[PDB]
């Protein structure tokens, strides 16, 4: 098998191809293992599941397919895009045997030993893609990556299982046994999905009217009027124009919301206390609380409030080399969803206000903030943006009902997503006893596998057709001089992605 | 071009044709102008946009097409209707030059000078139809009307623009140049849309059951029972019949709600204070509050509460000659959406009640009102009625998502609505200098244009098929004598619409 | 004639269309005039030439054709571009007569009176396009512009002419006489020229 | 806002005739398009005069002009990995939008815009 990475832009399609080198260890020393949360974990953190000897291939991030330059080409020139089909290949398989004896490691090729590969194309296994896990094909084509281990969760009561808990043995599926010189290929067609909106609106939902012309409709503009030395209740009505534009009758409503706490990138603005959980937005499922992250698509901040972001309401990526645990804000890249504030409520403020009572002579009108607003007829909204380093698709859970199944971390909801591609080194027993033993074999030859993997995805484009007169916004590299070029290697060969790149640069009217 | 107004009723279709005479001044003295809110405006009222020299034709009100008698014919005989296609014409164009000299105005026809016309049929301009603006074809065919000026809004930060703000020059579109003796025509096909519900339900969602037959299901009918000289907790259950009808198990839920303050048409019932804004129902978008008007479809009042209406929850039309600002209630016509109270919550009361706690021996059950209820599975609702003097369609905003896009002021949500029809007088420079000057011309011949416009719309009807035995409600003129006939001219030639007329007279079961 | 401004991007071509309104005075009160530098001008500034009653159309600036947004589209996405062909039109001609009498100006349309138009397609006149003069179609389509006056220079010795100096009378060319309701059109094909380099080198 | 073409002077020799103000050197450029109002004499004397007429009706002309140009493009095919430079409008708020009209209707071009944003190797 040959090496193919490039992008092919033709008409309204762009074909991306990526090739990487991978290495697959033996996981679990070939065993399936029951796993669960520690005895001391909080109820919110309990789980029960299985670890398996299998690995899996994950290309569920945009930078597995688009170079930074390709991404720029995409986002500056198109109002929409969406996956069409893909071709996946494993080739140049090599199985290597390791011998550690007497202090010295000696790796030797074993042309005969196999790896096993199958796609779960009937979606019979727990689908763990679409959880934003590490282990995807790396963004830089020269980086070699380890194939991540497949494990899954089932129902739990505390750290224990329940009757409904399921156990899957992956060897109960047919799989291809691949030797050196064997290749694995399959093709996949995406179901029809809406184009992702790679634009920002240039109008706000509350300013769709002609500012020059009054409405023929009236609104209640005054509830009382001067009487002698005092007021008297009098209802009075006006036709809204430009000057009272907030009062105009309108056809639509902003998108739903589920309110997030606001935190500041300026450390001093924040309360000195531990609220990351107690202040967090959450959902409550079967007695357990889970963080709602990133949650419903809501604008990250209002005008001129760049420093603020919702506590759990934005994707946050690590800078190159950032550690796992409690890194400072300078170690992460916080995405900003401000482009959708034309339609979607700001994540950190109320949806609006509703009346709570019935006013009368002795009772004044009362209102209350609305901090969670489910969908209402007439609402419109934008989904969360996608990012070069962000996820692509998610499997829509198989359920009686769902609403607007755009996966909340962003990307394309798929009923039949790209199937899980499972792989494992076939165990090779070491020297057996010459007396029969019924015990299952526990001594195996140490080995691992390596090879190349390629994934080709055809994307459909919706070309920008802007009729605006003035230039628009475009993603651009900096002109100024610098020690390192953005999206390159440094002097040590480390590739890095210095910033998140969304898709929403071009604009469109509502 | 000839004059065509009439209505043609054939089978399940009614074709409406309207012809009017229009006059188009020169707007902005041919200039595009940046416009914005005043420096002193509240944040809620800020805007940024452009005024253009162009005018536009707007027939987006039912009375542009239906005579009062036609409307009666429609609403008394049909359970539903919806637009199918339309034909639009401009003809008998006349361009007139005005000369004001020496005190005396002299208007002269200029057969050569042109008007420019284009439809935005690709929807590349900000769409300002569907904001309930004035300037539509007038209801009475003998009234001559001024073509309104086209302007639009884009993003703003206070009174300033932002990078994403867009500027549209309409001359960057192809347009037909029309002279005297030229006509402009185009045809348009409505996309499939649901029939408007021109009926009222004769059943309420909470009374769908057979009153004669008990349910086989049980509900919790008592939580405690007499014990010796005192009570003891005991759960007890009953099958609901007619006598406990409120308790029956049911399959459906009333429509969503977003609660409105209640105001009375009787002045004395109202609080003496200014609550028209502070008490108002609103949404909150990018740091700005906007009145929610008319908002989600909700019944205006409950049984026998005719005098009450939601503060911003009903369309309100002016009586003939009513002024723009702070008119008394006697100057306006307040619509009433009581017909939908069979399914949709009353706009001024709570959706219902939910439990807020977990009762036990030492803790009593607690409930709270629900003043905003987003959509739930099993909900059903009616959309707001349409009115003879009300809007017809609105453009569904171009967004990732929307829910039930029936425009909240009423009418038909269209992805591809009737296109904006833009027109302007071609500037004709006045006498130029005989020495070359690079400056753009600022001296033009004064002129205006006039002509006729006709719009033909074919409507599809869903004929009433009532199997009820007793007569039903029908819209009827008064029998009694009066000084003026409703929906006529007075002695001064002024046409007036004395009342709003909805569509919901006939009834149907749920 | 109808109004056409838009840009059409297809494959490896972009078609730009611009329409403007223009006004043409009477230049030189219909006369040809000899012109020259002032007597006091420096030798470096001397010239000799002719002013003519004719005007001319000049679209020799990019913003006559590309909107700013179009230009952005061009320069962000292409390594090169070059003109291929063009179509030019004059239409909706109106000839207006002005009467200034007794203090009052009255402008009246004259449907019969003509304008004369010709293209110098054999390049027999002094070619004054390409000198970066003002008077081109303005960048913003709603601006109305004055047609600039045609004049040219020939050889001079100081402010005087020489034997080799040439004089061109433009009425010695055939020209179309255009009335109200007449249109003028012609098409033109650019010769092959190198693509303009719409890139910067990333190497020195 | 700059020039497009220039006529290459008709000469025995020239070298690299790219016009120095920029744009395309053309041997046969777009032709000059000349226009003038036909003179209309005012009321003549009723006695014959050989003198050329010097009294004319004041007049001017107006109309529309359209120009359509087809341009050929050489599409960017950059194989560089990192993003490149692109012409972009400013994001920040401002009183006027660049390349628009102001409150008085005056259009303005706030900056020159060249063509050289994308890059290529030598």
Numbering used by the authors:
A (entry chain B), B (entry chain J): 226 to 735
C (entry chain I): 226 to 429
D (entry chain I): 614 to 735
Q: What do the paper's sentences say?
A:
In these analyses, we studied a variant of adeno-associated virus (AAV) serotype 2 containing a single amino-acid substitution, L336C. The AAV2L336C variant is of particular biological interest, as it is defective in genome packaging and is associated with reduced infectivity. The AAV viral capsid is formed by an icosahedral (T = 1)6 arrangement of 60 viral protein (VP) monomers, and has a molecular weight of ~3.9 MDa and an outer shell diameter of ~250 Å. AAV was particularly suited to our cryo-EM studies because: (1) it is relatively small for a virus and can be packed across cryo-EM grid holes in reasonably thin ice; (2) it can be stably assembled into homogeneous virus-like particles (VLPs) devoid of genomic material; and (3) it has icosahedral symmetry, which increases the number of asymmetric subunits in the dataset by 60-fold for each particle imaged.
The final map of AAV2L336C had a global resolution of 1.86 Å, with a largely homogeneous local resolution distribution within the core of the capsid shell that drops to ≥1.92 Å at the solvent-exposed surfaces. Using this map, an atomic model was derived for the common region of the VP monomer, residues 226 to 735 (VP1 numbering), which was symmetry expanded by icosahedral matrix multiplication to produce the full 60-mer viral capsid. As in previously reported AAV structures, the VP1u, VP1/2 common sequence, and the N terminus of common VP3 are disordered. Notably, map resolution increased by 15 shells (0.09 Å) after correcting for the curvature of the Ewald sphere, which has been predicted, but not previously demonstrated with experimental single-particle cryo-EM data (discussed further below). The density for C336 is clearly ordered in the AAV2L336C map, and the model is considerably improved compared with the prior structure of AAV2WT. There is a 1.4 Å shift of the main-chain of C336 and neighboring residues, compared to AAV2WT. This results in a 0.8 Å widening at the base of the fivefold channel formed by five symmetry-related DE loops (the loop between the βD and βE strands). In addition, the AAV2WT structure is ordered from residue 217 to 735, with the additional N-terminal residues compared to AAV2L336C (residues 226 to 735) occupying the base of the interior opening of the fivefold channel. The AAV2L336C variant displays a 2–3-fold defect in genome packaging compared to AAV2WT and lacks PLA2 activity resulting in a defect in infectivity. The annotated differences in AAV2L336C support these possibilities. An altered location of the PLA2 domain due to the N-terminal disorder would abrogate its externalization via the 5-fold pore and thus its function.
